[PDB]
């Protein structure tokens, strides 16, 4: 018996039209014949028992032509006496014929509770499945019910799924947030461990609580908030997705392709019952997954040479910030992602100030103190425009993640002796003075600033892990200790010789884009170090001399917001443009001295980076009262004054720096720019080293550039450039002593 698609409502509008009105699509048929024949295409008539009721009005030959034309256009379908009128309309609406669906749902399923899921809950899901024509065997699909996605029993299920090639679905229907999915398809989707790697990083407080717990000698039960309605909502919701998967699976095993409606394969759906929000989270299959992939990928890549190539430019990056955001948006997810969120912190009405918050990163905390020290350090976006600030925030968040030690990084155990000339002593990079090391504990105990932490002396007699790094200058591999190359590398309590920092770390759309930025960050910090700790008087910059209105407009904005803004030149022996933005509050309780830095071959971009960093740090803080200030730079912001720090304001003894004071040395190619920088460094006696931190499951390129000898802008007073460069440039006639270096640490 013949019928038009059961999900269509039929309304005849007589002379030439009949409309097919659906909930998600509407169609229109034109022709008087349609008006005559369609009313009898409701399922209540045969090709036989039709002609008997309209012959003498429409020939059998005309009917066939119409009942053929509706076929190869897709309006005709068969019935299935097995399905209700309602169910059949559901599958036809997805573009699946009723009888096939009935055949698909015939396929059985298995349910497996894990964790604390009761059998009454299992029985409820069974009932939900019955009701839609799906039986449970006591398979094509295994359904696992959990109270938490990090339940250790899932690791075993996952390994068995992989060896058995069993496709399975995860669901958490208890708690105030429903988790639904993914459907794992071995050799196609990621595995549970691909997911678990993300979850473990995104559960920082839970992770540290467990550490704190174990130290006192897999997950904790937080799924406590459940209504019988939210439970039923999740089970019933899952039954629908189970049916959709089975039906899609049944048809594609036959006509692969051809069925395109979305399923939970490679996706996790979260439905927050408390606040009412539904989000879709994409699971990335990690090629370096130790369970379903090859964990040796980063090891192998690290010991092979670095291959750079031409990168034409199209503000000297090779792609738009809109595009970078677009292809890496999927990383934004507290569940499957690496970036917790990406929020515009500043007022959209303001066209000059754009700062984003990109919140979440993780570590290693074993105490409440360190746990709130983590969680406090947020990734932030910086920009002249909203789009650039967005990309900045997103990419920094992925930058910080990629630098975190996972345990698969390229490494080999050795002493400094048995590596010889290839190995770089950590002291060449850290540059702490002998006096600082000697008075470690006393000095560290006296804090105003945590990042000034003095590590234990490196003990060359100890075997350590060394990471291979590519030298762009000498075109061969060198070695840094792994502890310097990545964040949160675990060291023995009695050989804590380093804490991996972020200086020279950078993300980019390509490797050479990232390397260029990383290098410039090093010149920036080195420039600040020379200026800050020698307390040099520097010339200001005439911001009107650059063909960039933004600078002086921003100055005017600061002016209207109780502030002065000025920029100092920090350009040193490498000759690369580098600057410090400085601003003080004119009224209020405190001066709130704030600083921002930038360096770039293009001085306009360098200044722009500096001034937008001032926006990033200081302006949101002017919002919050002195008493409410919990920022790391609190004491500085409240108590310190411009009068007691003359090296902050411009030297009126020197002329204003202008655009013409900065020679152009950038090209049309980012690769060339990188090779220009490395040679500049080489002429200054410095070696440029790169470690590629790019993670395959992330994609966005991340590196750490290291130039041993170049100074960090933290309080590190070992011999070297900090003392010598200012004299080489004539800024000082004789070097300062260690005891003459700025006793006030750079607080940002």
């Amino acid at each position: 018996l013949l019928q038009i698609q059961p999900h269509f409502h039929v309304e005849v509008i007589e002379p030439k039209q009949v409309y097919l009105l659906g909930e998600q699509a509407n169609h229109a048929l034109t022709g008087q014949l349609y008006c005559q024949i369609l009313p009898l295409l409701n399922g209540q008539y045969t090709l036989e028992q039709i002609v008997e009721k309209l012959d003498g009005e429409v020939p059998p030959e005309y009917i066939d032509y119409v009942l053929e034309r509706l076929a190869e256009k897709g309006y005709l379908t068969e019935a299935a006496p097995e399905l209700s009128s309602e169910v059949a309309a559901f599958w036809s609406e997805l573009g699946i014929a009723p009888p096939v669906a009935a055949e698909a749902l015939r396929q059985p399923v298995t349910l497996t509770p894990v964790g604390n899921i009761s059998e009454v809950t299992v029985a409820a899901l069974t009932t939900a499945l019955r009701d839609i024509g799906i039986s449970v065997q006591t398979t094509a699909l295994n359904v696992v019910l959990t109270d938490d996605y990090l339940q250790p029993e899932l690791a075993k299920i996952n390994k068995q799924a992989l060896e058995s090639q069993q496709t399975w679905l995860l669901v958490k229907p208890v708690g105030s947030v429903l988790w639904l999915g993914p459907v794992f398809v071995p050799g196609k989707t990621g595995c549970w461990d691909c997911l678990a790697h993300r979850l473990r990083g995104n559960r920082e407080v839970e992770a540290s609580v467990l550490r704190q717990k174990q130290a006192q000698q897999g997950c904790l039960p937080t799924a406590r908030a459940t209504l019988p309605s939210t439970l039923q909502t999740g089970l019933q919701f899952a039954a629908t997705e189970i049916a959709k998967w089975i039906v899609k699976y049944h048809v594609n095993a036959t006509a692969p392709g051809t069925v395109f409606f979305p399923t939970l394969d490679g996706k996790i759906i979260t439905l927050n019952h408390s606040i009412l929000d539904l989000k879709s989270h994409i699971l990335i299959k990690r090629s370096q997954c130790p369970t379903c992939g090859d964990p040796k990928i980063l090891q192998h890549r690290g010991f092979e040479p670095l291959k750079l190539e031409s990168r034409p430019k199209q503000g000297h990056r090779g792609t738009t910030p809109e595009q970078t955001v677009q292809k890496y948006q999927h990383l934004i997810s507290p569940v499957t992602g690496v970036v917790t969120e990406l929020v515009r912190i500043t007022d959209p009405a303001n066209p000059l100030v754009h700062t984003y918050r990109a919140g979440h990163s993780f570590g290693s905390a074993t105490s409440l103190r360190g746990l709130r020290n983590t969680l406090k350090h947020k990734s932030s976006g910086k920009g002249k425009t909203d789009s650039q600030s967005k990309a900045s925030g997103l990419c920094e968040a992925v930058e910080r993640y990629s630098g975190i030690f996972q345990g698969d990084e390229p490494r080999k155990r050795a002493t400094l002796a048995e590596l010889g000339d290839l190995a770089i002593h950590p002291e060449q990079c850290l540059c702490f003075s002998d006096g600082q090391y000697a008075n470690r504990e006393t000095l560290n105990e006296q804090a105003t600033v945590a990042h000034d932490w003095i590590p234990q002396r490196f003990d060359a007699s100890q075997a350590i892990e060394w990471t291979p790094v590519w030298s762009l200058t000498e075109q061969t591999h060198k070695y840094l200790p792994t502890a310097l190359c990545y964040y949160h590398y675990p060291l023995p309590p009695e050989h804590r010789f380093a804490r991996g920092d972020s200086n020279g770390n950078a993300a980019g759309n390509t490797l050479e884009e990232a390397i260029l930025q990383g290098f410039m960050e090093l010149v920036e910090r080195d420039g600040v170090a020379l200026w800050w700790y020698n307390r040099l008087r520097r010339p200001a910059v005439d911001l009107g001399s650059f063909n960039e209105p933004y600078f002086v407009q921003l100055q005017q904005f600061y002016r209207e917001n109780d502030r002065d803004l000025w920029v100092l030149d920090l350009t040193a022996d490498l000759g690369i443009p580098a600057f410090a933005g400085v601003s003080n509050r004119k009224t209020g309780s405190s001066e709130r001295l704030i600083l921002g830095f930038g360096a770039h071959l293009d001085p306009t971009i360098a200044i722009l980076r500096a001034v937008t960093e001032v926006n990033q740090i200081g302006l949101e803080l002017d919002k919050v009262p002195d008493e409410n200030l919990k920022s790391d730079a609190t004491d500085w912001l409240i108590t310190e004054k411009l009068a007691d720090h003359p090296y902050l304001l411009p030297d009126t003894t020197q002329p204003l720096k202008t655009a013409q004071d900065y020679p152009k040395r950038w090209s049309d190619d980012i690769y060339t720019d990188v090779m220009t920088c490395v040679n500049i460094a080489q002429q200054a006696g410095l070696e440029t080293l790169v470690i590629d931190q790019t993670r395959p499951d992330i994609g966005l390129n991340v590196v750490k550039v290291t130039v041993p000898g170049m100074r960090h802008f933290w309080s590190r007073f070992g011999e070297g450039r900090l003392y010598d460069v200012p004299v080489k440039l004539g800024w000082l006639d004789e070097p300062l002593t260690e005891a003459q270096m700025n006793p006030t640490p750079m607080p940002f």
């Binding site: 229109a28 022709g31 008087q32 005309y62 309006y75």
Partner: peptide, 15 residues
Amino acid sequence: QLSSQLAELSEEALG
């Protein structure tokens, strides 16, 4: 030779 009744038959998706 096709009847005009059969020819004027059109089908379209409004959306």
